[PDB]
Each structure stands twice: as C-alpha cells, then as structure tokens.
Amino acid sequence: EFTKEIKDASAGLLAAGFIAIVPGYISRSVAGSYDNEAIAITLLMVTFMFWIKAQKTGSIMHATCAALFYFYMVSAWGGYVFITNLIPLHVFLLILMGRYSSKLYSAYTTWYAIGTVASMQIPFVGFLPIRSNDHMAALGVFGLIQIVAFGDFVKGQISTAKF
Amino acid sequence: DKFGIKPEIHHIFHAEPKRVAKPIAVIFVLIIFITILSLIVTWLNSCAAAFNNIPTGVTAVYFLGFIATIVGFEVIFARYYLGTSIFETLFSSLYLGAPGLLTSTKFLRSFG
Amino acid sequence: LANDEYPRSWEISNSWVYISAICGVIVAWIFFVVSFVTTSS
Amino acid sequence: MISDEQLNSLAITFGIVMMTLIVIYHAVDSTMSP
Amino acid sequence: TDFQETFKTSKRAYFAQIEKYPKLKLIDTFCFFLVLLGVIQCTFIILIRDNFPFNAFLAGFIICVGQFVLLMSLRLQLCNSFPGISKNRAFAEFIVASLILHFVCLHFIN
Ligand SMILES: CC(=O)N[C@H]1[C@H](O[C@H]2[C@H](O)[C@@H](NC(C)=O)[C@@H](OP(=O)(O)OP(=O)(O)OCC[C@H](C)CC/C=C(/C)CC/C=C(/C)CCC=C(C)C)O[C@@H]2CO)O[C@H](CO)[C@@H](O[C@@H]2O[C@H](CO[C@H]3O[C@H](CO)[C@@H](O)[C@H](O[C@H]4O[C@H](CO)[C@@H](O)[C@H](O)[C@@H]4O)[C@@H]3O)[C@@H](O)[C@H](O[C@H]3O[C@H](CO)[C@@H](O)[C@H](O)[C@@H]3O[C@H]3O[C@H](CO)[C@@H](O)[C@H](O)[C@@H]3O[C@H]3O[C@H](CO)[C@@H](O)[C@H](O[C@H]4O[C@H](CO)[C@@H](O)[C@H](O[C@H]5O[C@H](CO)[C@@H](O)[C@H](O)[C@H]5O[C@H]5O[C@H](CO)[C@@H](O)[C@H](O)[C@H]5O)[C@H]4O)[C@@H]3O)[C@@H]2O)[C@@H]1O
Ligand SMILES: *[C@@H]1O[C@H](CO)[C@@H](O[C@@H]2O[C@H](CO)[C@@H](O[C@@H]3O[C@H](CO[C@H]4O[C@H](CO)[C@@H](O)[C@H](O)[C@@H]4O)[C@@H](O)[C@H](O[C@H]4O[C@H](CO)[C@@H](O)[C@H](O)[C@@H]4O[C@H]4O[C@H](CO)[C@@H](O)[C@H](O)[C@@H]4O[C@H]4O[C@H](CO)[C@@H](O)[C@H](O)[C@@H]4O)[C@@H]3O)[C@H](O)[C@H]2NC(C)=O)[C@H](O)[C@H]1NC(C)=O
Ligand SMILES: CCCCC/C=C\C/C=C\CCCCCCCC(=O)O[C@H](COC(=O)CCCCCCCCCCCCCCC)COP(=O)([O-])OCC[N+](C)(C)C
Numbered sequence: 001e002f003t004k005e006i007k008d009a010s011a012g013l014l015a016a017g018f019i020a021i022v023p024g025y026i027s028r029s030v031a032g033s034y035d036n037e038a039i040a041i042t043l044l045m046v047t048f049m050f051w052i053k054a055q056k057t058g059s060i061m062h063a064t065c066a067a068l069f070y071f072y073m074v075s076a077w078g079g080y081v082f083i084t085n086l087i088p089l090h091v092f093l094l095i096l097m098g099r100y101s102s103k104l105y106s107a108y109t110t111w112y113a114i115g116t117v118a119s120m121q122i123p124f125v126g127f128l129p130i131r132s133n134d135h136m137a138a139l140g141v142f143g144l145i146q147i148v149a150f151g152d153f154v155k156g157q158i159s160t161a162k163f
Numbered sequence: 164d165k166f167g168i169k170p171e172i173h174h175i176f177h178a179e180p181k182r183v184a185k186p187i188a189v190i191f192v193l194i195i196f197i198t199i200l201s202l203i204v205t206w207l208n209s210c211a212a213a214f215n216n217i218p219t220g221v222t223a224v225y226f227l228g229f230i231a232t233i234v235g236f237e238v239i240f241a242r243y244y245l246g247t248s249i250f251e252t253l254f255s256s257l258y259l260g261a262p263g264l265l266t267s268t269k270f271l272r273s274f275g
Numbered sequence: 276l277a278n279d280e281y282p283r284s285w286e287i288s289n290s291w292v293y294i295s296a297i298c299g300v301i302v303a304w305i306f307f308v309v310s311f312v313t314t315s316s
Numbered sequence: 317m318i319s320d321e322q323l324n325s326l327a328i329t330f331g332i333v334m335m336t337l338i339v340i341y342h343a344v345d346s347t348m349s350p
Numbered sequence: 351t352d353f354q355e356t357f358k359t360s361k362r363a364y365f366a367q368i369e370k371y372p373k374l375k376l377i378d379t380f381c382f383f384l385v386l387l388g389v390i391q392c393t394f395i396i397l398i399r400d401n402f403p404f405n406a407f408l409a410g411f412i413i414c415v416g417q418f419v420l421l422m423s424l425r426l427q428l429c430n431s432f433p434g435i436s437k438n439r440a441f442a443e444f445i446v447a448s449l450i451l452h453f454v455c456l457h458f459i460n
C-alpha cells in the first residue's frame with residue numbers, strides 16, 4: 001500500500017514480494033521472537049502509508065488515521081522516536097524547496113495536534129514530548145508552519161518586490 | 164549494648180504539593196464562564212450564525228438524528244469522564260455510531 | 276498507587292479552571308456545529 | 317509431522333510461485349496499459 | 351510606512367471576505383475566543399506561579415490549540431476546496447477529528 005502511492009501498483013507488488021522474505025526482516029521476525037519489533041516494524045509502514053496519503057491528498061481523516069497509528073506505535077516500541085523526527089523533517093524540507101501548500105498545513109497540523117496529545121497518555125512516555133530533545137523538532141516545525149501560512153497569505157496578497 | 168533496647172525509627176513523608184486557595188480559583192472559572200457567554204452572544208448578535216435555512220421537510224427527521232449523533236458522543240465522553248469503564252464506553256460508541264453514521268451521512272447527502 | 280487512586284479533577288481547587296475551560300470549549304463546539312449546518316451562506 | 321527438507325522445498329516453491337506471478341502481472345500491466 | 355500600506359490592504363481584504371460569507375465569520379470568532387481561552391489559562395499559571403496538575407493544564411491548552419488548528423484547516427478547505435475532497439467531506443472529517451481530540455483531552459485531565 002505504501003509503494004502503490006509512490007509509483008504504481010506493480011511496484012507495490014514487487015516491494016511486498018521483496019519484504020515478504022528478505023533476511024534483514026526475517027532475522028527479527030522469526031517464529032518465537034516475541035519482541036516489540038515484530039509488531040512495530042508493521043506499524044511503522046502502516047503509519048507512513050497514511051502520512052503519505054494525507055500529505056499528498058490533504059485529507060484530515062487520513063491525517064487522523066496516521067496520528068492514531070502513530071499513537072499505536074509509541075505504545076508498542078521505544079523507537080517511535082524515528083517517526084516523530086522523520087515526519088517533521090519531510091515537511092521542513094518541503095518548506096525549504098518552496099513547495100508549501102494548504103494540504104501540507106492541514107495534514108501536518110492535524111497529525112501533530114492529535115498524535116502528540118495522544119502519545120502523552122502512555123505512562124512510560126509522559127511529558128517527554130514537551131520537555132525532551134527528541135520531540136523539539138516536531139514543535140519547531142509546528143511553529144514554522146504557522147508563520148509560513150501567515151506569510152503565504154500576506155506575501156501572496158501584496159506584490160513580490162514589496163516583500 | 165549490641166543486644167538490648169534500641170532507639171525508635173519513624174519514616175519521614177514529604178509535604179504533598181499545595182493547592183491554590185479556593186477564592187482565587189473561582190474568579191477564573193467566572194471569567195471563563197463570562198467569556199463563553201460572550202462568544203455565544205457575539206455569534207447570535209453580529210448577524211452571523213443567524214438561525215435561518217432550517218430544514219423542515221423529510222430531511223428534518225434526519226437533521227435531528229445528526230444532532231443526536233453529535234451530542235450523544237459528547238454525552239458518552241461525559242459519562243466516561245465521570246467513572247464509566249472504557250469497555251462500556253467502546254460498546255456505547257459502537258452502538259451509537261452504527262445508526263448515527265448512516266443518519267448523518269444521509270443528512271449530508273440531502274443537504275446540498 | 277494505581278492510575279485510579281488519585282484525587283479526581285473536581286477535588287483539586289487548582290484544576291477547576293482547566294475543566295471549566297474544557298467544558299466551555301466542548302459546548303462552544305457543540306453550538307458551532309449546529310450553527311454551521313443550520314445557517315446558509 | 318512435516319520434516320525440514322520438505323519445509324525448505326515448500327518455502328522455495330512459495331517464493332518461486334510468488335515471484336513468477338509478480339513478473340507475469342508486471343508484463344501484462346506494462347504491455348496493455350500506456 | 352510600507353507596513354501601514356500592507357496592514358490596511360490586508361484589513362480591507364479580510365473584512366470584505368468575512369462580510370461576503372458568514373461561515374468564515376463563525377470560524378474566525380471561534381478561533382479568536384480559543385486564543386482568549388489559552389491566554390486566560392496561561393495567565394492563571396503565571397499569576398499563581400504553580401502548575402500542580404500539569405496533565406490538566408496540558409489538557410486545556412492542548413484542546414484549545416487543537417481546536418484552533420482544526421478550525422484553520424476547515425477554513426482553508428472551505429475558502430478554496432481541495433481537488434478530491436468536497437466541502438461535505440471536509441466538514442465530516444473535521445467533525446470526526448474534533449470528536450477524537452475531545453475524547454483524548456477528556457482522558458488526559460483524569
Ligand atoms: C543499557 C541501558 O541503558 N538500559 C536501560 C534499559 O533498557 C533495557 C530495556 O529495558 C530492555 N527491555 C526489556 C523489555 O526488558 C532491553 O532492551 P531492548 O530490547 O533494546 O528495548 P527496545 O525498546 O526495543 O530498545 C531498542 C529500540 C531503540 C531505541 C532503537 C531506536 C530506533 C531509532 C530509529 C532511533 C533513531 C533516533 C533518532 C533521534 C533519529 C534522529 C532523526 C533525525 C534527527 C532526523 O534491554 C535494554 C538494555 O539492555 O531500560 C531501563 C528502564 O526500563 C533503563 O534504566 C533507566 O535509566 C534511566 C537513566 O538513568 C540515568 O539517569 C538518572 C536520572 O534519571 C541518573 O540518576 C542515573 O545515575 C544513577 O542514578 C541511580 C540513583 O540511585 C544510581 O543508583 C544508578 O547507579 C545510576 O548510575 C543514570 O545515570 C533512569 O532514569 C530510569 O529510572 C526510572 O526507572 C526506575 C525503574 O523503576 C525508577 O526507579 C526511577 O525512579 C525512574 O522511574 C521514574 O520514571 C518512571 C517512568 O519512566 C516512573 O514509573 C517512576 O515512578 C519514576 O517516576 C518518578 O520520577 C520521574 C522523574 O523524576 C517523575 O517524572 C515521575 O512523576 C511523573 O509520573 C508520575 C507517575 O505516573 C506521576 O504521578 C507524576 O505526575 C504527578 O506529579 C506531577 C508533578 O507534580 C504533577 O504535575 C502531575 O499533575 C501529577 O499527576 C498525578 O496526579 C494527578 C492529580 O493530582 C493525576 O491526574 C495524575 O493521574 C497523576 O499522575 C509525573 O510527574 C515520578 O516522580 C531507569 O533506571 C536502562 O538504563
Ligand atoms: C538501587 O539499588 C541500590 C542497592 O540495593 C539502592 O541503594 C540503597 O539505597 C538505600 C536507600 O535508598 C540506602 O539506604 C540508606 O543509606 C543511607 C546512607 O547511609 C550510609 O552512611 C551512614 C553514615 O551516615 C552509614 O551508617 C550507612 O551504613 C551507609 O553507609 C542511610 O543514611 C539511610 O539511613 C536512613 O534510612 C534507614 C532506612 O530508611 C534508617 O534505618 C536510618 O535510620 C536512616 O533513617 C533516617 O532517614 C529516614 C528518611 O530517609 C527517616 O525516616 C529516619 O527517621 C531517619 O531520619 C533521621 O535522619 C534524617 C537524615 O537522614 C533526619 O532528617 C531525621 O530528622 C532523622 O534524624 C539508608 O540506610 C542504601 O545504603 C543503598 N545501598 C547501596 C549499596 O547503595 C538504591 O536505593 C536502588 N535505587 C532505587 C531503588 O531507585
Ligand atoms: C468517532 C468517535 C471516536 C471516539 C474516539 C476513539 C478512539 C480514540 C483514539 C485514541 C485514544 C488515545 C487515548 C488512549 C486511552 C486508552 C483508554 C485506557 O487505556 O483505559 C484507561 C486506563 O488508563 C491507562 O492506564 C492509559 C494507559 C494507556 C495504555 C493503553 C494500551 C495501548 C493499546 C494500543 C491499542 C491496542 C489495540 C488492541 C487491538 C487492536 C482508563 O480505563 P478505566 O476502565 O480505568 O476508566 C477510567 C475512567 N476515568 C479515566 C474517568 C477514571
């Protein structure tokens with residue numbers, strides 16, 4: 001499903017066939033390996049498929065599904081700190097490349113607003129998102145997307161050289 | 164003196180965090196109440212949100228169902244906040260969203 | 276102490292403000308949805 | 317039960333059938349669709 | 351004072367836009383009062399110099415900010431719809447997201 005959004009269905013089938021039996025995953029997904037990774041590495045892809053659907057459609061519902069599965073992951077694996085630092089970066093990059101659009105604002109602000117408040121409910125991870133260095137990236141991108149929305153209404157209003 | 168009476172020992176507990184005096188926290192509740200009242204008055208009397216275009220045909224029996232869904236979810240959450248279990252909350256949400264989804268997608272389909 | 280055994284929100288005079296604000300926002304959202312559907316542009 | 321060399325043959329057969337169906341699907345989709 | 355020129359032009363365009371449609375007025379007043387609620391809670395914290403229930407303060411502030419962002423997203427989708435999403439879908443998605451945020455914040459305050 002994640003690769004059917006990047007290119008085409010045939011590529012998605014190829015990627016599924018590859019990841020079905022690749023040893024790099026079998027090493028940690030062998031029968032009897034009852035650890036966090038077995039579940040996590042599935043939720044990682046289930047979350048990146050919804051983040052890509054939301055980022056390229058602008059839907060609020062898909063951003064909400066992405067936030068829900070992100071919460072499902074903070075509560076399963078301690079490596080959720082990957083997503084919370086890789087989804088902001090993406091957005092951040094799209095801002096430097098001059099590709100900001102209302103879909104970006106909608107998707108990212110929904111994902112953050114929902115997922116960050118739902119990830120503090122896990123007794124283990126509690127109050128860290130606001131006070132730790134692992135999540136300051138998402139907060140900074142949150143702020144930057146609001147200054148950029150404002151400047152995308154104001155600069156768009158007035159002429160270019162007037163900026 | 165290795166064998167004999169020994170001095171007592173009592174644990175030392177910490178002082179629990181202090182809570183602001185009550186008369187200082189009721190004023191802010193009053194401020195918030197007045198603020199919400201002012202918001203509702205601003206909508207009601209600034210020519211916005213004027214209560215027109217109310218459906219009254221067959222779609223009205225659907226509009227009420229739409230309202231019933233929204234308010235009913237906020238009632239379920241209220242109950243949950245007051246002590247109701249989480250499984251009872253999930254089952255209530257299921258039971259109330261099964262017909263509510265239909266009635267509230269039909270309302271949106273009928274209201275252009 | 277279990278997650279259940281803690282002074283509830285209504286027992287602490289310090290948290291009356293935040294719960295009042297939550298209730299106010301939920302009632303304003305409930306009135307906003309109704310006034311957004313009912314009225315026409 | 318089933319032995320080990322049999323489960324190896326079964327795994328290999330599943331993999332080969334999967335990769336052949338995938339190749340056939342890709343050929344069909346690439347030749348009959350612009 | 352080019353700042354003044356841009357300011358006056360923005361005010362003109364904005365008040366014209368919010369008179370042309372009432373729904374934008376609803377959204378804007380709701381956002382303004384949400385900002386007021388957030389200022390009120392921040393002021394409480396500063397004035398008393400303590401935040402003993404951090405989960406309650408966080409619940410309040412986060413519900414306010416989440417409602418603000420959701421309203422702004424709905425406003426964007428309303429003023430200029432997206433390619434594959436009708437305004438009824440942009441309203442139902444907003445309703446669902448708001449309900450989920452309400453539940454999460456209600457569970458956060460204990
Ligand atoms: C080697 C190592 O390291 N190790 C580690 C480990 O690990 C391990 C694991 O575990 C295992 N596992 C198993 C399962 O087994 C294994 O593994 P693995 O497999 O590997 O796993 P994994 O997951 O899988 O992993 C892997 C993954 C990876 C990660 C991968 C990755 C991936 C990726 C991708 C990455 C990437 C990244 C990136 C970034 C990217 C980038 C990008 C870009 C940029 C773009 O194995 C392993 C290993 O082999 O682990 C462990 C654990 O588990 C650990 O341990 C730990 O450690 C730590 C650290 O340590 C350090 O530090 C410290 C400091 O801290 C220091 O100190 C130390 O030093 C020292 O110390 C000591 C002292 O004694 C000594 O002794 C020692 O020796 C040392 O040396 C160090 O240095 C630590 O910290 C920790 O600790 C902890 O824990 C413990 C246990 O128990 C305890 O005891 C302690 O205490 C602590 O705890 C704490 O916390 C917890 C949680 O967490 C809790 O539970 C407890 O209790 C405590 O808490 C307390 O405290 C705190 C702080 O202070 C606080 O905060 C709290 O409080 C809170 O909470 C509570 C409860 O809940 C509450 O209550 C509260 O709240 C309240 O209050 C407040 C205030 O006032 C207020 O505000 C509020 O309001 C309230 O609330 C309440 O009330 C209300 C009304 O009123 C109501 O409403 C409510 O409800 C309530 O709540 C709060 O605040 C408390 O107090 C440990 O130890 C190791 O290390
Ligand atoms: C991880 O695992 C490790 C290893 O298992 C854990 O490490 C152990 O932690 C224990 C407590 O956390 C600790 O026990 C304390 O050690 C203190 C250090 O004493 C050393 O120096 C003295 C000389 O000053 C030596 O005699 C002694 O042998 C040590 O070498 C002690 O000072 C502590 O004694 C107090 O507590 C015990 C039991 O609670 C009492 O029996 C004792 O009388 C002391 O009690 C006073 O304090 C308590 C409150 O703490 C009061 O309730 C009590 O009424 C007494 O109050 C008087 O004194 C206070 C000031 O202290 C004063 O305000 C009051 O008015 C009274 O006058 C205690 O024995 C272990 O040593 C330590 N072991 C190692 C190897 O490190 C570690 O905790 C674990 N980590 C976790 C679980 O997170
Ligand atoms: C359209 C309408 C949509 C409605 C919203 C739907 C979904 C919301 C989305 C996300 C919610 C995030 C907040 C989580 C709260 C959980 C409630 C709870 O965990 O129970 C809590 C237990 O506290 C906790 O330890 C929370 C710790 C969280 C651990 C949860 C385990 C992770 C599970 C991951 C998913 C597993 C799926 C399995 C099958 C696939 C209370 O339970 P209680 O019985 O004590 O009642 C108490 C009533 N008080 C609160 C008023 C007193």
Ligand SMILES: CCCCC/C=C\C/C=C\CCCCCCCC(=O)O[C@H](COC(=O)CCCCCCCCCCCCCCC)COP(=O)([O-])OCC[N+](C)(C)C
Pocket residue numbers: 317318
């Ligand atoms: C989403 C779909 C996914 C599809 C793929 C998923 C899983 C398959 C992948 C790998 C399978 C691993 C094979 C492990 C076998 C170990 C047990 C063993 O070795 O059995 C073998 C026997 O076998 C067979 O002849 C079984 C032949 C029957 C063919 C399969 C029938 C179709 C079943 C699938 C559909 C079911 C529902 C259909 C309608 C809904 C040894 O039996 P025994 O001596 O130990 O005991 C038995 C004791 N007597 C000998 C006395 C009885």
Ligand SMILES: [Mn+2]
Pocket residue numbers: 035036
């Ligand atoms: Mn492990």
